[PDB]
Amino acid sequence: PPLQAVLVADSFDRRFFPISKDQPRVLLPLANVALIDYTLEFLTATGVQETFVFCCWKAAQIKEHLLKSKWCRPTSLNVVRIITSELYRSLGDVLRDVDAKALVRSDFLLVYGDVISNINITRALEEHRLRRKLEKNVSVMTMIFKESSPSHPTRCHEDNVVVAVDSTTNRVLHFQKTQGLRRFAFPLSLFQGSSDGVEVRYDLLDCHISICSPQVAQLFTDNFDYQTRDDFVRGLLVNNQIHMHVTAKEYGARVSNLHMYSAVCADVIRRWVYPLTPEANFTDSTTQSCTHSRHNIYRGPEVSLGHGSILEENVLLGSGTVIGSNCFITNSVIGPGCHIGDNVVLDQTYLWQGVRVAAGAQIHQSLLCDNAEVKERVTLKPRSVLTSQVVVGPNITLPEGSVISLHPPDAEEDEDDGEFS
């Protein structure tokens, strides 16, 4: 039985703004390389020869970016199935396409293009396959999804999951989410059936990983009233039971909001995902080959350090970069071409292509984008976002929230740049 997978781009229960305008929601460079390459080398990390990535959004961009990888050509163990922008909305018409075009035999991986992880998936794949062979296809799927605490930066309350499940034969009972509930109640009718007992488990975070054999193509196209996977599996859990496996060590999580962007970009360089750690140069980008050093710093080539710039935890630079003096940079990533001048203080900056920072500028908890001539004393605070060529000047400061850009209605800015409020 050969092993393929489908790879959706983006469920449009939308949380990314306004970063999903010029570049998409999925070409999101976490450490100076596109996030499609991270999730695609997760899919190449475990053994899958052929996978289906679906595109909806500006086929010219993802077309051009998938013209200069090295699995453009099938010399390696992948070539990539890509298609162009007819009628596509979300995962709904994705699975309706995957059982209308019918590119499925059995047991493929359903992941978004938005998970980065290190599960070598094949273990519970074969345990699930044993459960299929032995017991008459009553068990639909198996989901593997982490063991953790009730307190973690990745278990923020958007994808908080409690499940109730037995531990002998690990079939789930309730996939009850917790986006705002605080009293819990479980319908007691399904405990007299298993009188030896049943656990409850909150030690969970969903990896958005799970396998699927095309019984769910039948239970998905027949039942139109499920579109997202969560009300889907709850409808599975009210009427076919679906199983469970608790992995112990390796993890991944779906980078949904920018909260997960912060947690993952501070975890790949705290390095909980090795083999994935960006010194490997997954692309053929000689403009990415970076050199690891003590306490997790990563100097780029022709780095041009500023004198006295002290580095403590988890930083980078790029290629062609000129960094200035007196930088107390910690837990950040920097992008290429940056003419970041003298005495620029940073802390967890996620700076991207083409920037030229002016001198004497604190920047704090930020993430900004291409061709941004940022200027004097732009002091920020947690959860602040500049985006895509908009220019601030002599201390146009910003508070906690910053939905700003260069486009007029989404931003806090008109046609021109942010020089004057």
Binding site for another protein (CB under 8 A): 118, 146-153, 162, 182-189, 191-192, 195-203, 248-251, 270-274, 277, 279, 291-296, 313-314
Q: How far is the CB of 233 from another protein (least distance, A)?
A: 20
Q: Which of 358, 360, 365 is nearest to 402 (CA)?
A: 365
CA distances in angstroms from 208 to 111, 145, 362, 386, 401, listed in the order given: 6, 8, 37, 29, 28
Identity of residue 358: A
Q: How far is the CB of 35 from another protein (least distance, A)?
A: 20
Nearer to another protein, 4 or 319 (CB): 319
Q: How far is the CB of 300 from another protein (least distance, A)?
A: 13
Rounded distance between C-alpha atoms, residue 112 and residue 207, angstroms = 10
Looking at residue 133, the DSSP 8-state letter turns out to be: H
Structure tokens at 7: 């790879």
Residue carrying structure tokens 């935890």: 313
Q: ω before 18 within 30° of 0 (cis)?
A: yes
Q: How far is the CB of 295 from another protein (least distance, A)?
A: 8
Nearer to another protein, 23 or 349 (CB): 349
Query: Are the CB atoms for 373 and 389 separated by under 8 Å?
Result: no
Nearer to another protein, 273 or 372 (CB): 273
Nearer to another protein, 48 or 204 (CB): 204
Cβ–Cβ contacts within 10 Å for residue 67, how many? 8
Cβ–Cβ contacts within 10 Å for residue 338, how many? 24
Nearer to another protein, 191 or 416 (CB): 191
Q: How far is the CB of 201 from another protein (least distance, A)?
A: 6
Which residues on adjacent β-strands are paired with residue 163?
Answer: 175, 201
- Rounded to a whole number of angstroms, the distance between the first and last alpha carbons of the chain is 62
Nearer to another protein, 192 or 239 (CB): 192
Q: How far is the CB of 209 from another protein (least distance, A)?
A: 16
